């Protein structure tokens, strides 16, 4: 159901009616009526609402920050920092985005040929949970900067984040009908795609639901992007700072309650520092503080909700069954809200299913190699190809390690992370297109051709 | 069935066995271990291969002209022009490939941080038969200059030109498994899709093919381009130099014996000027030489095959039945062969199914409008958006043309067409995505972003 309910202690605090499909029809009406005027804006008009925006968000931020927390348990400090974050892809729209989208001539027999950028119309986006601010500015930004529209179809667990962000760019002097929250559950996204206003759509989340988006968006030839998690490798090999590789390992793994699509997941430890380095992550992993995460000091809240809880627990327990080893943690706390403790699994069978999952939660796997090569393989032994990091100073292997891990993101000597000035996006498994820098700008916009005699 | 069928004489010349799922599935293990090597092989071998590939369709081109009109009837002078652009976008992408491929750097706290390029492995492409050597050549010589292996499945009425293709590549020096042409039907490209090498997939054709590979590639998270039919409008204004927009029209319309998808397909003109021009429109149609596609006198030769002409026919026959007038031909040709003359169609009732189909065929549609918000209005009501031509030397007239027509293209005093320079691409029902130009070779590659501390 759509509803707030506070994964710290369970309670249900408020119910919200979803959307009937005439409301979403008549949303889609207004919205197509606000684009035939908003394509016509200025873009110092579209720039002002998007620093307005900028601003509201850097004025009220720890109140924006209460209802993440509230609604989905990330640490109200990370979820400051997230409205912080979201600011910052305001600003970097509001500062470039007319640069992106200028003319590109190119020297033809033609007086003048050139590729101009238009915006497409109505752009639904479907977000998860687990970043209920930042997904959406992400996407908001440049999608409205370029003079698309949007509706938003966000999880059903973040209704007032969602009526938040819509409110926010209501505030900040976007018209309505630019932006619009939908209030609707995953079975009704299908009418959204189907409408023959709705132009694109882009999904941030599972799998399962991107295949569903996606498959039904091709039947209608509409274009998409997907950004669908990811299992990533955290390579520390021989050569690495080992002291700064466990604590950024261990922020990487346990950041967002371990809920990010670039958590790092895999630890892959070459075997001449991999005892100190797994005896170290072992100490960091607890020694971190686990409780409500409206407190400063908190490390670790509770999962966003029970069926995360259920789902890693299943996992954690059934690759033990199997013959993995718990070194720490492995089993949901005996208190009230979804938590589950920061845990680390070893000796992990081949041919364990575990191997080939995501874990949404501060569940970190590791192993041993020998050499580069079976670092590289490992690394990309898996469905996904979201973000990868390496750890070493070594120059050839920081290229091989660049070249060769099959993924969308390489970080060498740092946790791989999201900045509005670079591309952002996965391969395989993880998903296709790309958000953030010149891309996410480029990405739903009519790239119209012109040739002048 | 696969086989070649000589649309001018009826006769079937040569049938060929269609690969089994087990065939196909050795087709792609080999492209799989062939992408493995090619992945690694230089720019300048790419670049080697790519410019004998020109050197061979600029050596031998009026065999393989021939090869094109024996399959789908195109004038054999149509064809050698189609063998040379073919030439022209392999030696586009020898020559810039690289460069459109080269690392873009961005400043950021990052000692070096910046995207990389890097292919993405096996793609499909799903081709047409009315471009039978250019629409594989416009996506394969991007796709090779960027590391990719590629797996063809071409129209089954053109199988000759589908091994030609191959062969030519071969000949070249591509590597085994480099590119592979799969002599498959409709109903065997879901294993493709399916297949877990297959990393992404094109399609070029109706929307019913776009649809169906758009939706299978979706549900398998997998990124796609599609290019689909329109049904573009030619508008004529006062101040156009209307010899020429009558020369330049009717080669729109009538080029490939009418069967391309940026055929001017609707003639939209401006009251002031729209008997003469209608007049001198249907004064060069009743001239056009139908005929033998080999003679170098021919204009226009028959439809690719018995379904092209039944359909246009059928179109045609429905749109006079309710109340169309044919101010010249509209009926098939009584000859061998699958001919259908040049033919205009006047006074279209409104609400008329025609006026939102794609006519595959010389056969155009006229139009009369009162001023440039008519003119705008009635060239965009169609759920297709691929190009659009507009002729006028008004320059806020040309501004708002290009500004508010709602296609991928636009050309002011010119037909359409596509140029390797410029990126080619459709928007609403014809498609998204863009081939040519940068885009063309940004399309299939992930595009990593490297952050190095
Ligand atoms: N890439 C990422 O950042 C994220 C990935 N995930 C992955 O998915 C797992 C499960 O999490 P879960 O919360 O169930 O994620 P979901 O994929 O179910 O939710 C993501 C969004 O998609 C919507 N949705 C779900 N199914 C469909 C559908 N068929 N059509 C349209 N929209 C749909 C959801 O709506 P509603 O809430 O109404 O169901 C929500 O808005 C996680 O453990 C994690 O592995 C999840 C969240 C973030
Ligand atoms: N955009 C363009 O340039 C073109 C557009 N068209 C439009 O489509 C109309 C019909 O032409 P037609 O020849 O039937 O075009 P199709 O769309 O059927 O054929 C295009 C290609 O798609 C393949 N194909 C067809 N259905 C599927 C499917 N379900 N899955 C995968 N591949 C498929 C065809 O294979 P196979 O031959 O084996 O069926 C061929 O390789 C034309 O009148 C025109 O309006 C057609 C050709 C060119």
């Not at 070249?403 to 296709?432: C, H, W």
């Amino acid at each position: 159901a759509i509803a707030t309910i506070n994964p710290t202690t369970g309670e249900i605090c408020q119910r919200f009616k979803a959307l009937t499909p005439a409301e979403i029809d008549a949303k889609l009406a207004k919205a197509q009526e606000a684009f035939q005027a908003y394509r016509r804006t200025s873009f110092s008009q579209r720039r002002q609402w998007l620093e307005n925006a900028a601003a509201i968000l850097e004025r009220d931020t720890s109140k924006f920050a209460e209802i993440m927390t509230t609604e989905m348990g990330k640490t109200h400090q990370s979820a400051i920092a997230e409205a912080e974050k979201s600011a910052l892809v305001c600003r970097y729209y509001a500062e470039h985005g007319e640069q992106f989208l200028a003319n590109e001539y190119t020297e033809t027999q033609a007086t003048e040929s050139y590729v101009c950028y238009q915006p497409l119309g109505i752009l639904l986006a479907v977000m998860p949970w687990n970043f209920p601010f930042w997904q959406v500015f992400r996407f908001a930004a440049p999608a409205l900067m370029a003079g698309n529209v949007a509706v938003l179809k966000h999880a059903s667990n973040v209704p007032q984040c969602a009526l938040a962000v819509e409110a926010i760019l209501e505030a900040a002097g976007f018209p309505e009908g630019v932006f619009q929250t939908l209030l609707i559950g995953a079975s009704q996204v299908e009418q959204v795609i189907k409408d023959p206003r709705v132009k694109a759509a882009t999904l941030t989340g599972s799998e399962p639901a991107g295949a569903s988006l996606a498959s039904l968006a091709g039947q209608e030839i509409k274009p998409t992007l997907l950004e669908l998690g990811g299992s990533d490798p955290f390579v520390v090999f021989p050569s690495a700072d080992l002291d700064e590789a466990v604590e950024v390992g261990t922020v990487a793994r346990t950041m967002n309650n371990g809920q990010s699509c670039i958590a790092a997941k895999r630890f892959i430890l070459h075997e001449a520092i991999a005892a100190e380095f797994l005896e170290k992550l072992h100490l960091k992993f607890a020694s971190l503080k686990i409780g409500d995460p409206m407190a400063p000091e908190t490390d670790i809240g509770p999962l966003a909700t029970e069926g995360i809880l259920q789902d890693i627990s299943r996992q954690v327990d059934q690759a033990v069954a199997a013959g993995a080893k718990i070194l720490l943690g492995g089993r949901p706390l005996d208190r009230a809200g979804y938590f589950y403790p920061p845990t680390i699994l070893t000796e992990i069978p081949p041919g364990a299913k575990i191997l080939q999952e995501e874990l949404f939660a501060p569940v970190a796997m590791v192993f041993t190699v020998k050499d580069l090569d079976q670092a590289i393989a490992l690394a990309n032994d898996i469905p996904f190809g979201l973000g990868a990091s390496a750890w070493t100073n070594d120059p050839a292997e920081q290229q091989r390690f660049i070249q060769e891990l099959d993924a969308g993101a390489v970080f060498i000597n740092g946790m791989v992370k999201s900045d509005p000035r670079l591309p952002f996006g996965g391969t395989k498994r993880s998903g296709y297109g790309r958000e953030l820098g010149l891309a996410g700008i480029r990405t739903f916009v009519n790239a119209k051709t012109v040739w002048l005699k």
